[PDB]
Each structure stands twice: as structure tokens, then as C-alpha cells.
Design an enzyme around this catalytic site. Structure first.
Site, mmCIF file in Angstrom:
data_model
loop_
_atom_site.group_PDB
_atom_site.id
_atom_site.type_symbol
_atom_site.label_atom_id
_atom_site.label_comp_id
_atom_site.label_asym_id
_atom_site.label_seq_id
_atom_site.Cartn_x
_atom_site.Cartn_y
_atom_site.Cartn_z
ATOM 1 N N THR A 14 12.570 -5.242 -67.030
ATOM 2 C CA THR A 14 12.045 -5.135 -67.651
ATOM 3 C C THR A 14 11.215 -3.699 -67.907
ATOM 4 O O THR A 14 11.323 -2.613 -67.914
ATOM 5 C CB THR A 14 10.565 -6.379 -66.774
ATOM 6 O OG1 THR A 14 10.197 -7.067 -66.448
ATOM 7 C CG2 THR A 14 9.494 -5.879 -67.875
ATOM 8 N N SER A 17 13.955 -4.081 -56.620
ATOM 9 C CA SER A 17 13.987 -3.619 -57.668
ATOM 10 C C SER A 17 13.451 -2.673 -57.526
ATOM 11 O O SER A 17 12.407 -1.773 -58.064
ATOM 12 C CB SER A 17 13.603 -4.262 -58.630
ATOM 13 O OG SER A 17 13.749 -3.456 -60.225
ATOM 14 N N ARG A 51 13.432 -7.612 -71.772
ATOM 15 C CA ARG A 51 13.539 -8.151 -71.038
ATOM 16 C C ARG A 51 14.988 -8.766 -70.338
ATOM 17 O O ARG A 51 15.418 -9.406 -71.383
ATOM 18 C CB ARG A 51 12.701 -9.709 -70.425
ATOM 19 C CG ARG A 51 12.435 -10.481 -69.322
ATOM 20 C CD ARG A 51 11.922 -9.429 -68.342
ATOM 21 N NE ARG A 51 11.652 -10.435 -67.092
ATOM 22 C CZ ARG A 51 11.201 -10.113 -65.723
ATOM 23 N NH1 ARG A 51 11.960 -9.531 -65.224
ATOM 24 N NH2 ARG A 51 10.578 -10.663 -65.049
ATOM 25 N N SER A 84 15.604 -2.119 -65.223
ATOM 26 C CA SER A 84 15.911 -1.941 -63.881
ATOM 27 C C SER A 84 17.019 -2.744 -63.316
ATOM 28 O O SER A 84 18.043 -3.188 -62.533
ATOM 29 C CB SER A 84 15.539 -2.864 -63.109
ATOM 30 O OG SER A 84 13.972 -2.136 -63.098
ATOM 31 N N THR A 122 18.080 -8.085 -62.042
ATOM 32 C CA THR A 122 16.475 -8.239 -63.678
ATOM 33 C C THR A 122 16.234 -6.772 -63.992
ATOM 34 O O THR A 122 16.538 -5.876 -63.169
ATOM 35 C CB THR A 122 15.373 -9.096 -63.425
ATOM 36 O OG1 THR A 122 14.494 -8.566 -62.312
ATOM 37 C CG2 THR A 122 15.703 -10.581 -62.963
ATOM 38 N N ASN A 127 11.484 0.905 -57.013
ATOM 39 C CA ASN A 127 11.618 2.631 -57.842
ATOM 40 C C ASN A 127 11.578 3.426 -56.709
ATOM 41 O O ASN A 127 12.895 3.824 -56.825
ATOM 42 C CB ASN A 127 10.531 2.484 -59.135
ATOM 43 C CG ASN A 127 10.495 1.269 -60.212
ATOM 44 O OD1 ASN A 127 9.675 1.039 -60.497
ATOM 45 N ND2 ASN A 127 11.958 1.674 -60.910
#
Length: 266
Positions: A214, A107, A220, A46, A212, A109
């Protein structure tokens, strides 16, 4: 050297956690401050949502897009981790800026995909990277499949140095208008997903904004900027640690933040 302590402490983390840690810290002109596995390929996950927002802001800056334009959708837009998209579904749209804020700060989607639909897909995201001097970063798929992170697969990858330099270009290199630059910086500072990752390892008085990521296979990531001792920096951290738990990976990226802190303050 303080530079040697930085290298050694990261390699200790790598051995102790069975991880690979990519770091690039660059100044506002994209000159290297410090790195580790700088030119090594990692999955973006992301983290690309930040450059995606920058792309959208450039379209608004360039008069090819409108912040309040309503982007309509139905239930097919909802994919795993689409908290805002699901909330706005009944209303039948999110605006460009709503979707972008959700992409960056939550984040989200579905919101990411909603924008991708509007701006010309993964190919246009890649075009934007090339346009701003990033010949390395590439988006090939939408969410969630872009998060597969298969070792050796070049799709949906960047390197720490390339992405640090993209972040520096977007925030400090004049890629966006002053207004758009400040908006994206505030979104990053107010990001809701990074409390336990990089900024957990920075001192409390540092101004920090980040995005961030993942993925599968223990990825990460955290990318963004910090202001320390009144100097500005762009940073890209990419880690892979298949044998750690989710919380242990957060802790690892925070530790990497601590290692960065001691170098900077040294």
C-alpha cells in the site's frame, strides 16, 4: 477470446473505479501468460519486502549471512507500522530470520529497515535485482519514505512484467536453494496481510502465497504465486485508485483476482 474477456473486464474495472490496473502472469520460465499495462511503471510499496527476503536468503545460501545473527537496535528503528519490531525492542534485537519473517508476513517497516541496514541499503536491494536479471525494479529509499509514489517519479518503482519475472526467478528459476525457496513460499502462503486482496478472488483450493503493498496516491499491490490445475504461475498485480477508500482498493485487487481466475479456468 478468453484473452479478450480478461482485457475487457480489467478495462471496465479501470473506468468504473478510476483506476489503473497493472497485471503480469508468467509461467515458471518467465514466459507471458497474460498481462495488462505490463511494462508500465508502478510504485513497489511493500511488495519489495518479498525480494528483500530472497536477497537475505541468498546471503545465507552463499555463506555471507547467518539466520540467527542478532541485529540489535534502539527506539529509532521504530517507524510507522513496525508491530514486531516494537514487540522485540525491549529485548534489544531481532535475528535476521525474525526480521525477515516480520517483513514478509506482517509487512513490518522497522524490520525491513533493520535488514536494509545490514545488507547495504537500497543500493544493495537494487544490486540484487540486477544480479537475478531484473533490469527494471529499483529501491531508492527505506521505509516509510519509499512509499510516497509520486506520479512520474521513477524511484522505488517496478513494472508488472519485471516483478512477475523476478518472482518466477526466485521461486522457480533456481535463485535460491530448495530449502530457502520452500521457506519463502511457506511465509508467503502464511502471509497475514493479504486475506482481502488477490487471494480473496481466487478459488479456495488454489495454493497461493503473496506479499501486499500500500502506498500514497491510492496504490494497492499484491505479488506472488499460485498453483491452479496443478500448474504453477507467478503473478504481479499493481493498482492505483486515488478516489477509492482503503477497503474499496482491497475489493478492487480481489476483483482482479476473480478476473484472473476466469481466464485461467477458461
Amino acid at each position: 477470446s478468453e484473452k479478450l474477456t480478461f482485457k475487457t473486464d480489467l478495462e471496465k474495472l479501470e473506468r468504473e473505479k478510476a483506476a489503473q490496473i497493472g497485471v503480469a502472469i508468467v509461467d515458471p520460465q518467465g514466459e507471458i501468460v497474460a498481462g495488462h499495462r505490463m511494462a508500465q511503471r508502478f510504485a513497489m510499496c511493500s511488495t519489495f519486502k518479498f525480494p528483500l527476503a530472497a536477497l537475505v536468503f541468498e546471503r545465507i545460501d552463499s555463506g555471507t549471512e547467518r539466520g540467527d545473527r542478532k541485529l540489535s537496535y534502539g527506539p529509532d528503528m521504530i517507524v510507522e507500522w513496525s508491530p514486531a519490531t516494537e514487540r522485540f525492542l525491549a529485548s534489544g534485537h531481532m535475528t535476521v530470520l525474525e526480521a525477515a519473517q516480520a517483513a514478509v508476513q506482517l509487512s513490518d517497516n522497522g524490520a525491513t529497515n533493520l535488514l536494509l541496514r545490514e545488507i547495504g541499503g537500497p543500493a544493495a536491494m537494487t544490486q540484487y535485482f540486477r544480479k537475478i536479471g531484473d533490469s527494471v525494479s529499483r529501491l531508492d529509499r527505506k521505509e516509510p519514505e519509499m512509499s510516497d509514489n509520486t506520479p512520474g517519479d521513477l524511484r522505488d518503482t517496478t513494472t508488472p512484467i519485471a516483478m512477475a519475472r523476478t518472482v518466477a526467478k526466485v521461486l522457480y528459476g533456481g535463485a535460491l536453494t530448495s530449502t530457502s525457496t520452500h521457506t519463502i513460499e511457506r511465509w508467503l502462503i502464511g502471509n497475514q496481510t493479504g486475506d482481502a486482496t488477490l487471494r480473496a478472488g481466487f478459488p479456495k483450493d488454489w495454493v497461493v502465497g503473496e506479499k501486499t503493498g500500500t502506498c500514497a496516491n491510492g496504490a494497492r499491490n499484491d505479488i506472488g504465486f499460485f498453483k491452479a490445475q496443478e500448474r504453477d504461475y507467478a503473478v504481479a498485480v499493481y493498482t492505483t485508485a486515488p478516489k477509492l477508500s482503503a477497503v474499496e482498493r482491497d475489493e478492487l485487487v480481489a476483483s482482479v483476482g476473480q478476473v484472473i481466475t476466469q481466464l485461467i479456468l477458461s
